[PDB]
């Protein structure tokens, strides 16, 4: 799911018990293996510092009769990621109600104790956890496929700045190109 077009799609299916986790990844661009090859992350690997908000636009590419609500939550570092929706609520969340305008922007605000953060891994500073939970299960009528998809998009805000240039680690060479 890392050698096909299966990588980009996040499987969503109707599950009877609600509180199931859709996805979950830490926010730590330019180190996290989820943002390591994205456009934002690849610019970020040429810099040692970064500061600013990050926008995660989730786009529902299901059927046109499928519905569902999702509780998209970002829980700052203070504990080790929610494992229940009832814990995820307490963070900074946005309940996305689908039905026209097939995208909803969960904007992750700047919560850090410093005016910059490292792009490379460090433990003096961390970026918390981004999780998604079902708020209200995917209700799909008859003759409509019960497995839909969501797409996640990463973009920078306008309060964004990078400082101190270094050179990437994700490019290499051995002998010169003949």
């Amino acid at each position: 799911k890392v050698n096909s077009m299966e990588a980009y799609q996040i499987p969503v299916r109707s599950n009877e018990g609600s509180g199931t986790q859709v996805f979950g990844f830490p926010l730590q661009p330019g180190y996290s293996s989820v943002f390591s090859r994205t456009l934002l992350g690849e610019i970020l690997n040429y810099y040692t510092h970064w500061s600013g908000s990050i926008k995660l636009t989730f786009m529902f590419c299901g059927s046109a009769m499928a519905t569902g609500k999702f509780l998209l939550a970002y829980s700052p570092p203070g504990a080790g990621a929610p494992t229940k929706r009832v814990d995820a609520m307490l963070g900074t969340h946005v309940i996305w109600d689908v039905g026209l305008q097939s995208s909803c922007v969960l904007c992750i605000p700047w919560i850090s104790q410093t005016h910059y953060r490292f792009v490379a891994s460090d433990e003096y500073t961390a970026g918390g956890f981004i999780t998604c939970w079902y708020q209200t299960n995917i209700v799909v009528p008859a003759d409509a496929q019960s497995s839909c998809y969501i797409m996640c998009f990463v973009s920078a805000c306008n309060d964004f700045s990078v400082r101190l240039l270094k050179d990437t680690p994700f490019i290499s060479q051995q002998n010169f190109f003949q």
Partner: protein
């Protein structure tokens, strides 16, 4: 701006957007605001929780069956676990709150059903035994939905609540519950109910871990119904947010 299908309620950190719904039902005509000095009975200094006890606390989801009786959640006792609301009510003798009770339920366009979302202030429930009072563990939730039943609860020496949908567990006809602020979640079109409760009590401020000033009741008047196949699990999720919280008399942790 454009269509009224959209709404977006931002309180603190959490936002609830809904693609499609209707108008917000505002209280009795009052929106919760802080208590002024001409109503303040407390002589002590109150705290201001502000944004950190005004987020939308998402209570337990419950699954709506094809035929299901209904549900109710007490209001200061569904939030006595979640976040800092559950803390503050225990460290403080007096508390004053308003609410944004937002009940959200989605369904496909081949499903039908219709919930009545009322908020009954001061719902004093009867009892199966006609001379005993309810228990405090059947009567109250724990943030869990308690559900009624469609047949009378049999009498004995039990202290279980009298639970029948049609009498609402209070001994009033269910069809008259609409006086109180409410809304309907008709699955045909309109997929949420927003009811803004302002603080309602006979005294200006009251303890919340002994008195439950509001009781949300979600009663399906038209059972969920559909054809064979499709999906068969349409949950109802409740997101409640305290609004204009204010406490006084900083005691110690209690019951």
């Amino acid at each position: 701006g454009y269509s009224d299908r959209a709404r977006s309620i931002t309180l603190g950190n959490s936002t609830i957007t809904t693609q499609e719904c209707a108008n917000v039902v505002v209280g009795y005509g009052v929106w919760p605001d802080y208590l002024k000095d001409s109503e303040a009975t407390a002589e002590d200094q109150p705290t201001q929780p502000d944004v950190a006890t005004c987020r939308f606390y998402t209570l337990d989801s419950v699954q709506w069956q094809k035929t299901s009786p209904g549900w109710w959640w007490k209001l200061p006792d569904a939030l006595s676990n979640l976040g800092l609301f559950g803390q503050n009510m225990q460290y403080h003798y007096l508390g004053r709150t308003g609410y944004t009770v937002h009940v959200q339920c989605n369904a496909s366009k081949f499903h039908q059903g219709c919930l009545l979302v009322v908020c009954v202030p001061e719902a004093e429930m009867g009892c199966a035994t006609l001379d005993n009072t309810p228990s405090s563990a059947e009567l109250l939730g724990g943030d869990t939905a308690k559900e009624f039943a469609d047949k009378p609860v049999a009498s004995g020496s039990n202290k279980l609540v009298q639970r029948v949908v049609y009498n609402a567990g209070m001994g009033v006809g269910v069809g008259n519950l609409t006086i109180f602020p409410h809304q309907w979640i008709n699955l045909r079109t309109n997929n949420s109910a927003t009811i803004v409760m302002p603080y309602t009590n006979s005294v200006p401020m009251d303890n919340m871990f002994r008195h439950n000033n509001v009781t949300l009741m979600v009663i399906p008047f038209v059972p969920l119904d559909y054809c064979p196949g499709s999906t068969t699990y349409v949950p109802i999720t409740v997101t409640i947010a305290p609004m204009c919280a204010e406490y006084n008399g900083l005691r110690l942790a209690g019951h």
